[PDB]
């Protein structure tokens, strides 16, 4: 973590925060790394609200109301100074963190924090004032989640194996405890040590800025890479310096069908390589007048899909008049591959009764109209309650129109 | 605007992501590095970027009733180029990075009918018939309720009025029919993209054409519908990324015969 | 209601406004919620215009217009005196609330007033005042309007 913080640090421009809650330790994280780069060969310069205290090679201007010094008109001022890097207290506003946003583009490295809970909190809290997506993605080097853990004093710290869910955070696995004692005095804890999760900006990382991924798909991406908050204080658990308490605190419908076995182009999950359907419509009417029986005309089931690999594949079972032995018609709600597929459409002995294709000019995916001509017909639906879960079973829905009895 | 000018001696070639193009065949643009003349940044000296809005006839008015920034800012942007694109020319020739431009701020389709010759202005497909629309299909007889036959219909094209319009005028009218005709059509981007659907006709006539045009249209365009004996319809899959998927998936049938093929 | 007062005034942190028109005993409501919390365990702090009245065991700045000494000045030198607790008589403007957000972040928990006719009217007026939206959010614990 030093290492790469040094390198990031060390850098001829760029933006790096320093993230975290109040009484993590931020300063003093950034204070140490200005007293590192503090060389001769560097013009280092602050602004801060107040001076928490001074380091001798170092310019350190405070924020000072009197005049109408402020975070801005401080920034702005040293920016006039020709400084190598710059460290502003924090960047509380948008006009701060827009000329920070510019000092780090024109040639200085900055050096800020915020009051975020995680190393994606600074990355969105930046886009969150009014910093356009992109000036993140070019300018920001990285972010440094940091909090502070009280150290189990070594004098008297109680051994203990974890237990299974314990042991399920992280062969005689034995972690500390907090106890209380005459140096203890009397808590379990004397001084204190940082935790930290260092968020380091690359090539796949400006993308997700750039295109707006979102917390979530860049917490996913950020987890493949880099170690969490979490991992990093459980390995000094590991090591027997704090405790597994003081890290803890601390811490539009979608629809498919499946004709046989002809693979589609579906991206989903649990409905990989079928066909994607965009719209359908399937009926039926009964000629029994009751003005006086009859008989049930079932009509061929219609949908639309994008021209895909299975499109020669319909053409030639069209062409041929080889039926398949079943296809599925599958409707979801909204949300993704976990909600509830709440109508499906089970067809057998299937033929392919026509396919119309085409496009234009100015369309970028080409669609075509396919209708299905069967045999049999099974519908499930399945009921739904007001939050969401399942309402019992699902009724079936099932004819044989060959032979036109119910199935 | 002024924009900080790379440093020729050291700066990096990069190729454009889809954010970055969508601003704006291989894009390469460039980035700012480091260096001992680029001491150390990545960057020596200035240009200018620029946005002269003239005052012309049309600009006179909405100035006088009072349009308004927006409805002035739409008139603005039809006649003179903004100043974010002068930039963004700067950054193709090589001169500033994208980062400093910032800070200071469909699919083709072609046909082939035999050897006669469009107007195609495409770098690969030259000297080809322009393709605006298409429609094509066919229809099964057979039925599961209880043998039929397949009917395949005539291939729809819609294309501008061209130097081939005669020369199709003509085979409808002899009835002589062409050896090949091939429908490609092709992802959006350039001559590099994927062709990922190539309609092959063979022994084809032209069935129709329909011809016109309006009082309004700068380009009069026509409909013709193409018969053929066979056809070969080959779909190119591709990855995530843009890649080819695997080899193309193939439909082949004599229309003639009522074959595979 | 009170159960539910006294664990959002009891937090380490946050803002908490009671809201109503003039004469709808807002202070009476923060004097008794201060009363509440006045331990030897927390360092409760307050600038009023003026003072209602002493409680004992709290300290209890008034704002002098003859130094000019202001609620942006006073919550200002408050803040470094190592409070746990800070309340305002009342968030006027946008340089007293910057200042009321800033101390509900950085781990005081902060007590106001404002003249606003409904619960949402109080966020509704931080929103006009000038703070970003955002900012409300993370900070707000909630509104009493009384």
Request: with cysteine; glycine share 8%.
């Amino acid at each position: 973590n030093h290492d790469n913080f040094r390198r990031l640090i060390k850098r001829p421009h760029g933006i790096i925060l320093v993230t975290g809650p109040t009484g993590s330790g931020k300063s003093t994280t950034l204070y140490a790394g200005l007293q590192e780069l503090n060389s001769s060969e560097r013009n280092i310069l602050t602004v801060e609200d107040p001076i928490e205290f001074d380091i001798d090679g170092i310019g350190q201007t405070q924020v000072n109301p009197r005049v109408d010094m402020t975070f801005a008109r401080g920034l702005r001022a040293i920016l006039r100074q020709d400084p190598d890097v710059v460290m502003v207290g924090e960047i509380r506003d948008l006009e701060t963190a827009q000329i920070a946003v510019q000092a780090s583009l024109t040639g200085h490295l900055v050096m800020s924090t915020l009051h975020t809970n995680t190393a994606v909190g600074a990355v969105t809290r930046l886009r969150d004032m009014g910093i356009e997506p992109f000036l993140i993605s070019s300018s920001l080097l990285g972010v440094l989640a940091q909090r502070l853990v009280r150290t189990l004093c070594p004098d008297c710290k109680e051994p203990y194996e974890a237990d299974k869910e314990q042991r399920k955070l992280f062969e005689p696995l034995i972690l500390y405890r907090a106890t209380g004692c005459p140096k203890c005095n009397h808590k379990g804890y004397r001084g204190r040590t940082g935790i930290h999760e260092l968020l380091l900006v690359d090539d796949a990382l400006q993308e997700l800025i750039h295109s707006e991924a979102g917390e979530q798909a860049m917490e996913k991406h950020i987890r493949a890479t880099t170690p969490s908050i979490r991992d990093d204080g459980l390995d000094k658990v590991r090591q027997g310096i704090t405790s597994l308490e003081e890290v803890m605190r601390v811490t539009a419908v979608d629809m498919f069908i499946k004709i046989g076995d002809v693979k589609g182009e579906s991206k989903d999950k649990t409905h990989a390589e079928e066909i994607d359907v965009l719209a359908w419509s399937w009926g039926m009417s009964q000629s029994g007048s009751m003005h006086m029986a009859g008989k049930v005309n079932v009509q061929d089931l219609s949908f639309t899909k994008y021209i895909d690999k299975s499109t020669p594949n319909l053409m030639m079972a069209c062409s041929s008049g080889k039926h398949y032995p079943q296809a599925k018609l599958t409707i979801r709600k909204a949300g993704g591959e976990n909600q509830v597929e709440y109508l499906i459409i089970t067809l057998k002995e299937v033929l392919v009764s026509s396919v119309s294709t085409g496009g234009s000019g100015g369309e970028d995916r080409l669609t075509e109209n396919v209708t299905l001509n069967f045999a049999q017909v099974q519908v499930d639906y399945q009921p739904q309650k007001a939050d969401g879960a399942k309402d019992g079973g699902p009724v079936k829905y099932g004819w044989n129109i060959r032979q036109n009895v119910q199935a």
